[PDB]
């Protein structure tokens, strides 16, 4: 149930999506907050409700959600989202 959404934000800065999950919350990094016209309408493929497990090359590290943050933070201006259906 993988779904790749390529979100490349430049200049403007910031993304426009929110996540939470990991071994800390005993959950997967799931999208929980999506601002209108934000990465949901900017990548024409983002949207809360989907389960997240991979970015910029399937990287959702097993610790806490920040394992994704570390992944998305240091990666590149392109956020590749691979999502699974809960």
């Amino acid at each position: 149930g993988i779904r790749k959404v390529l979100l490349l934000k430049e200049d403007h800065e910031g993304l426009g999506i929110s996540i939470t999950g990991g071994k800390e919350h005993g959950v997967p990094i799931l999208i929980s907050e999506i601002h209108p016209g934000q990465p949901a309408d900017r990548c024409g493929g983002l949207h809360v409700g989907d389960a997240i497990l991979a970015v910029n090359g399937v990287n959702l590290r097993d610790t806490k959600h920040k394992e994704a943050v570390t992944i998305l933070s240091q990666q590149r201006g392109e956020i590749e989202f691979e999502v699974v259906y809960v």
């Binding site: 929110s18 996540i19 610790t63 959600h65 394992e67 994704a68």
Partner: peptide, 8 residues
């Protein structure tokens, strides 16, 4: 914020 969850 401090734990590990996040907002992009």
């Amino acid at each position: 914020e401090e734990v590990q969850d996040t907002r992009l």
